């Protein structure tokens, strides 16, 4: 198991705590898997459900990889690239909903 740092910003507002989400390193993961993990903390920590995201103006997260690369994922999109990647390469995840 791997604990990935994440931050949540809702309507521009971010909080000062340090939080981590549990991600499996047992196999390579997809962005569909990561979406489910991101949506899990939006629901538990902010009361923002899957259907709430359908009505949000913007809902995204950015995966920062340890090599300095980044990927922006739109949580309102049902289009996925069918690739796998290692959870161990993730530096942090910045979650942003408006």
């Amino acid at each position: 198991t791997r604990y990935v740092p994440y931050t949540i910003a809702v309507n521009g507002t971010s909080t000062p705590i340090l939080s981590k989400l549990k991600i499996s390193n047992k196999q390579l993961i997809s962005y569909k898997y990561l979406n489910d993990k991101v949506k899990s903390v939006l629901k538990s920590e902010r009361g923002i459900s899957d259907l709430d995201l359908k009505f949000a103006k913007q809902a995204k997260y950015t995966v920062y990889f340890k090599n300095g690369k980044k990927q922006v994922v739109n949580l309102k999109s049902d289009i996925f690239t069918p690739n796998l990647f290692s959870a161990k390469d993730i530096k942090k995840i910045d979650i942003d909903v408006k």
Partner: protein, 218 residues
């Protein structure tokens, strides 16, 4: 690949597995003894040095003596646009030349600009998930698909298995679409999740890049 069948061993000897330390993550196609072709989104965020290029594989769970393994020396792209998923193609130059034999062969590509019409019968393939909630395949999978022009866009080749929840899935990115014995597609994105039975799979249109591909590999 969801809803497909096992390929016969080494039936598609141009088929390539791209691997990290954690194993298979994307497919590719051998297009010259020292070059493979994949999707640009597969390697956009990975370290080139972490990629192992595995040729001649069939069952990823076996130690197959047929295999030849290479590193990546550098990559070539042509206008990949991550926001619009346009030009989702990359060429990876290998640190050597594969030895061509029964199990490792170079694919054949179409002519520049060739377009496939609605209804052309093709074959998709790859080691991606066997189902939406399943693990990656051990044995290379293949799937009969049909080219569709509805629910597509001109920037892609789109394919569908009519009436069935079947299609490419995670780990199939970068894998070839074979039509009439030629590589017309590189697996690029799905819509509505894998194997929706509602929306076609989108492939990067290889025939639009043939002129470019030829200039890199010469």
């Amino acid at each position: 690949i969801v809803g497909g069948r096992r390929a016969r061993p080494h039936a598609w000897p141009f088929m390539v597995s791209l691997q990290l330390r954690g194993g298979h993550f994307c497919g590719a196609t051998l297009i010259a003894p020292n070059f493979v072709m994949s999707a640009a989104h597969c390697v956009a965020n990975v370290n080139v040095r972490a990629v192992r290029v595995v040729l001649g594989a069939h069952n990823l769970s076996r130690r197959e003596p047929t295999r030849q393994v290479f590193a990546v020396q550098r990559i070539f792209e042509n206008g990949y646009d991550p926001v619009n998923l346009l030009n989702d193609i990359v060429i990876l130059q290998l640190n050597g030349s594969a030895t061509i034999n029964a199990n490792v062969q170079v694919a054949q590509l179409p002519a520049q600009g060739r377009r496939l019409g609605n209804g052309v019968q093709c074959l998709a393939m790859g080691w991606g998930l066997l189902g939406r909630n399943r693990g990656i395949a051990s044995v290379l999978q293949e799937l009969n698909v049909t080219v569709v022009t509805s629910l597509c866009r001109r920037s892609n080749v789109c394919t569908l298995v009519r009436g069935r929840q079947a299609g490419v899935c995670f780990g199939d990115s970068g894998s070839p679409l074979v039509c009439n014995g030629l590589i017309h597609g590189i697996a690029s994105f799905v819509r509505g999740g894998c194997a929706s039975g509602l929306y076609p799979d989108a492939f990067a249109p290889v025939a639009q890049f043939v002129n470019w591909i030829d200039s890199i590999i010469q």
